[PDB]
Design a protein around this ligand. Structure first.
Ligand SMILES: CSc1ccc(-c2cc3ncnc(SCC(=O)O)c3s2)cc1
Length: 284
């Protein structure tokens, strides 16, 4: 009895070809690389099932599409290109973020080529995107590093925030949940700022700030905000980076700075050495 809204599957297959590339995303909302047959341009195709856990999800998918559409003008948020639909799926044709996940730069596995200068730039770009979301009363609520992508890694490109499946107005992965989520306090923009704190910590230390031996220990670490700031873990991390993280990883969401205040943090203030600085004392 369900009528389809978006462009037909026959049109999808006419205009695009799926590639064999493995994108390492979920088994329940598959994301595949695809190519426009006309232009050769690469896209990501995300296949969202309309029925999940015995529930109709089409309204929720429609809301997610509404959020991506509102963020079209923000280059820090993945762009939505087209939408298709078949019996069981709504397919989002997304801008392809060829660098993959920022998570890859946070690995123990990686002996690293990521400088503090690069971290500063990535965090600044993340903050630009989240500022834009918060200004439009959207809280992402799933800003794990797996949901922040890169336009490239060689060289290091630009940030693309993805997956607005949990986004709201003003049950994630345990280690990424803010303390207010664990207390069922209401949703605040401050929850996203907590996650930015985690991202910075992981980029700089290549370790998870809260994860424990098991979920019970993870929840203990989060609700107590028990974070390793030891000299060993932070011997190659600047005080200013430490300050930025510590201002975000605080229990009380109301004490966390806004994305806007973060963008003014001293850590992020940097002059591009190839530009001619104009000092306060002028030549006249
Ligand atoms: C293993 S190398 C690799 C390279 C690129 C990518 C991806 C590119 C890309 N561009 C847009 N969206 C996505 S995931 C979107 C979503 O999960 O909601 C993705 S995942 C993932 C992995």
């Amino acid at each position: 009895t369900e009528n389809l809204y978006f462009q037909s599957m026959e049109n999808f297959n006419n205009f695009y070809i799926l590639t064999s590339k493995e994108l390492g995303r979920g088994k329940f909302a598959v994301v595949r690389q695809c190519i426009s047959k006309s232009t050769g341009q690469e896209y990501a195709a995300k296949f969202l099932k309309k029925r999940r856990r015995g529930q109709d999800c089409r309204a929720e998918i429609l809301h997610e599409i509404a959020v991506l559409e509102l963020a079209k003008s923000c280059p820090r948020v993945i762009n939505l290109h087209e939408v298709y639909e078949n019996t069981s799926e709504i397919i989002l044709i997304l801008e392809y973020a060829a660098g993959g996940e920022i998570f890859s730069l946070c690995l123990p596995e990686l002996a690293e080529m990521v400088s503090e200068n690069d971290v500063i730039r990535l965090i600044k770009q993340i903050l630009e995107g989240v500022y834009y979301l918060h200004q439009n009363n959207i809280v992402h609520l799933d800003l794990k590093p797996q949901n922040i992508l890169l336009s490239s890694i060689y060289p290091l490109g630009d940030i693309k925030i993805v997956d607005f499946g949990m986004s709201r107005k003003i049950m994630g992965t345990p280690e990424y949940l803010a303390p207010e989520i664990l207390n069922y306090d209401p949703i605040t923009t401050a929850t996203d700022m907590w996650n930015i704190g985690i991202i910075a910590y992981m980029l700089l230390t290549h370790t998870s700030p809260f994860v424990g031996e098991d979920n019970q220990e993870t929840y203990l670490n989060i609700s107590q905000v028990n974070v390793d700031y030891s000299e060993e873990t932070f011997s190659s991390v600047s005080q200013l980076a430490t300050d930025f993280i510590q201002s975000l990883l605080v229990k009380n969401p109301e004490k966390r700075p806004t994305a806007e205040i973060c963008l003014s943090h001293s850590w992020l203030q940097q002059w591009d050495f190839e530009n001619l600085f104009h000092p306060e004392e002028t030549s006249s």
